[PDB]
Amino acid sequence: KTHVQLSLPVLQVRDVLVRGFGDSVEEVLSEARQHLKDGTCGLVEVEKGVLPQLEQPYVFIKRSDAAPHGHVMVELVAELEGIQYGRSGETLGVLVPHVGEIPVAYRKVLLRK
């Protein structure tokens, strides 16, 4: 399938134990997709002071469309030193590994895989 319905655990930035997916734009996008597939991916909602607490490169989920079965359609965009790789809509949050942190909510998304 080109798209997959996922329910992403929303984590508080100060709870996150593993604060990025790796060391290159290509690696973080790769790892993010693997974790999304394995159900081991969390979402941090971006506000003032969140991103500097996480590790670059960042992986964003961004709205790709204006929501089948409650699931907002999203795609992945990476960022490193203020350059983005991809072009998409509004940020829903930054993806991080989920290693058992207790979430505050779930974000239902339809991921272009």
Curated annotation (Swiss-Prot):
Source domain of life: Viruses
Protein name, entry field: Host translation inhibitor nsp1
Span within the parent record: 11 to 125 of 7096
Residue ranges annotated for the CoV Nsp1 globular domain, each copy included: 2-113
Subcellular location field: Host cytoplasm
Record region (Disordered): 1-113
Functional summary from the UniProt entry: Inhibits host translation by associating with the open head conformation of the 40S subunit. The C-terminus binds to and obstructs ribosomal mRNA entry tunnel. Thereby inhibits antiviral response triggered by innate immunity or interferons. The nsp1-40S ribosome complex further induces an endonucleolytic cleavage near the 5'UTR of host mRNAs, targeting them for degradation. This inhibits the integrated stress response (ISR) in the infected cell by preventing EIF2S1/eIF2-alpha phosphorylation upstream of stress granule formation and depletes host G3BP1.
Outcome after substituting residue 37 to R: In strain: Omicron/XBB.1.5, Omicron/EG.5.1
